[PDB]
Amino acid sequence: QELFNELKPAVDGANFIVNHMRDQNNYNEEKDSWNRVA
């Protein structure tokens, strides 16, 4: 489908943003864990 081929960059970008925010959130949660240990 040409529709899916044209939207594939959009889907890849959406997944990249999703992974970026998820990794950032996990990084942040580990930082709060260290803060609580302190």
Partner: peptide
């Protein structure tokens, strides 16, 4: 299809900016 093209442009720009942020 201006709407889908603008969506692709905006999403690609955001992803590129976040990739640059990751490299930084």
């Amino acid at each position: 299809l201006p709407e889908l093209r603008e969506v692709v442009s905006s999403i690609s720009y955001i992803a590129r900016q976040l990739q640059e942020q990751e490299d930084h």
